[PDB]
Design a protein around this ligand. Structure first.
Ligand SMILES: NC(=O)c1ccc[n+]([C@@H]2O[C@H](COP(=O)([O-])OP(=O)(O)OC[C@H]3O[C@@H](n4cnc5c(N)ncnc54)[C@H](OP(=O)(O)O)[C@@H]3O)[C@@H](O)[C@H]2O)c1
Ligand SMILES: NC(=O)c1ccc[n+]([C@@H]2O[C@H](COP(=O)([O-])OP(=O)(O)OC[C@H]3O[C@@H](n4cnc5c(N)ncnc54)[C@H](OP(=O)(O)O)[C@@H]3O)[C@@H](O)[C@H]2O)c1
Lengths: 340, 348
């Protein structure tokens, strides 16, 4: 019988994920949960398809829907933090439903959220199911670099990066980045060892430290404004940015290690001049010397987030019970013809 | 984790690649070098002294005596870094197989030799099967090209086209390899009968990209209709100097060669790979690129700029040692292996 799959959340990501999972003949969508949006309608009609024979169910009824529909996995595409997804995780664990989530933090949440991660580990262990996640950060950043790093004899430094256009993420995300502003205490740009939530690059640094078998001393984030040598216009905050005014934000996560290996990753959200593009880069310094690195220009991150998730489904079902970080998994399941 | 005896490793060949591979394997505490074979070069000297190191207690042995050396030294694997073709390495493969020694080779063709050399590959498969050992290879083409793309391709829902590429400086590969890529030829000389540009259904050996195409077709579970190669000379808008042929290359004279391998498939998937070997002008760099077209639609690709390919060839090989020993007997293409063994601190 095909894998029984729930879509937990049905916004931008799981709408697109649904189109692909409908085509997959090794999968059967058994449930699609939203909060309030589209809640009476057939999920296929929502996304421009023929009726599928399954209705979008409500957030409040999640636990009952997961009990009666008997999914082996829920694709949790709701929120970013172990705290904010806790309620959805609990509904899954209590009904013996495995989870792959695209929640950024769950790339590696052990140090950013120690107690909430421990709780979710123990809960999934108790009901004998697995929690895994990270989406784009899991597959396109960490797993790509894990393959590349096999070709290193000695790593002294991992120097990695993620660049996105923050003007295309709405207000709220623009406000959380220094767009419009100019290091004050109540401005993001102030940071401390206790500040929460941590950046995506914080969780990626800990993923690498785990994969490379390193011992973390400290991961510190340093938040720095971006500027342009010319006047920009922001269509996010609706104002010109004069020269020397903040256009966006870099979070640089620096991990020091008892082995002397340095891990530096930059998260860059800014408005973009001529020539700026969305980017992933990973570079390894050591031996081989002079830099072993890859770049991805203009990655279709939204679609790739969903396919990474799809590549982890059977692995998540088959993983040991508990919170399993992706460094403990094999590579994303290989592309093969004949699944559609 | 209980102690395992160190892997017993032979270096079969001892030129540019295995000299550098030796320096790294000496540092690896999970490995014991048990033999280093050359043809004639350095035969009789201690392999450590050859490569600027303290005496290791192992002398460089001769090509003709390979079978005896592999019999008395009892290696579990031979790192075969000699020649490029399943035909030309046959005699070294036979020495290994008959002494139950597994092989990882950097022989370009053994990325995927099944269609470029059907009968010789079948023979080597059956020989390794009979002696219950594994033949695996491809070096830089295996790990940095095919395996990197295999990870990236997991992120595809549907692949319509793979568009891939490899660029290297042939002026740094000696006179013979420069001549094989047509450096210093006029275009007309380039396209003369059995010149570098000449191409036919009977042409042999095939390009590296030919074998990579078939690796992808195997990995993606596709059925090959035809792979054709098309050869094109490279030119430069200014005069270059070639160290390899030791003279100026006038404007419009061939600076090297592009081999484009195009594979069609019963599934409608197209696989196109370019091999570019030429003399560089200012701003030319060594490159790998792989791009996947389909769904996701917006272009799923990576580029590697300025890879240290010689050292990466060796580390790829090192990442395959335990896998090769562990693999089922026979000729095992790397699409049937897991990813290159992950980097982990504390092996040195
Ligand atoms: N890993 C990556 O690189 C990556 C990339 C893309 C997205 N993400 C993250 O993934 C998350 C989802 O993104 P998206 O674009 O799909 O978001 P979205 O469009 O905001 O969709 C959220 C969906 O989840 C539902 N939801 C929220 N809270 C819920 C709850 N308690 N119970 C049930 N359903 C609930 C929403 O219902 P309503 O419509 O009724 O609110 C909606 O259906 C975000 O946190 C985003 O940052 C990660
Ligand atoms: N897959 C990849 O990415 C990749 C990359 C680089 C190289 N390669 C290939 O690897 C091969 C070797 O490369 P290289 O740069 O190390 O070459 P090299 O400097 O020519 O060394 C080759 C070694 O093999 C020895 N040898 C040759 N035939 C032998 C035989 N029958 N028995 C024993 N030893 C033998 C040679 O001995 P003598 O010095 O005494 O003649 C030499 O020690 C070539 O085919 C090259 O094209 C592949």
């Amino acid at each position: 019988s095909p894998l029984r799959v729930a879509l937990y959340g049905f916004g931008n990501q799981n709408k697109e994920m649904a189109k692909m999972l409908v085509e997959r003949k090794d999968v059967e969508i058994v449930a699609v949960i939203s909060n309030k949006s589209n809640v009476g309608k057939d999920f296929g009609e929502v996304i421009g398809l023929a009726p599928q024979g399954i209705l979008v169910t409500a957030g409040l009824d999640a636990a009952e829907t997961l009990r009666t529909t008997n999914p082996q996995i829920a694709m949790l595409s709701t929120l970013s933090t172990v705290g904010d997804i806790e309620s959805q995780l609990r509904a899954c664990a209590e009904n013996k439903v495995n989870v792959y989530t695209i929640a950024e933090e769950l790339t590696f949440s052990w140090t950013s959220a120690p107690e909430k991660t421990k709780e979710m580990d123990e809960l999934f262990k108790e009901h004998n199911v697995s929690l895994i996640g990270g989406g784009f950060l899991d597959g396109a950043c960490c797993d790509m670099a894990r393959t590349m790093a096999a070709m290193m004899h000695k790593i002294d430094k991992l120097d990695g990066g993620l660049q996105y256009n923050v003007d295309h993420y709405g207000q709220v995300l623009a406000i959380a980045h220094g767009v419009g502003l100019s290091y004050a205490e109540n401005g993001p740009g102030w940071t401390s060892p206790t500040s929460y939530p941590k950046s995506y690059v914080y969780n990626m640094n800990d993923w690498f430290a785990s994969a490379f078998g390193l011992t973390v001393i400290k991961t510190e984030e340093v938040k720095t404004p971006t500027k342009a040598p010319i006047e920009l216009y922001s269509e996010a905050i609706g104002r010109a940015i004069p020269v020397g005014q903040c256009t966006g934000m870099i979070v640089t996560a620096t991990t020091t290690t008892e082995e002397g290996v340095i891990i530096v990753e930059k998260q860059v959200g800014k408005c973009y001049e001529d020539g700026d593009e969305d980017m992933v880069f990973m570079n390894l310094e050591g031996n081989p010397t002079g830099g072993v690195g890859f770049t991805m220009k203009n990655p279709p991150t939204p679609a790739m987030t969903n396919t990474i998730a799809i590549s982890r489904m059977f692995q998540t079902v088959d993983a040991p019970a508990g919170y399993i970080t992706t460094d403990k998994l094999p590579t994303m399941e290989a592309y093969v013809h004949g699944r559609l």
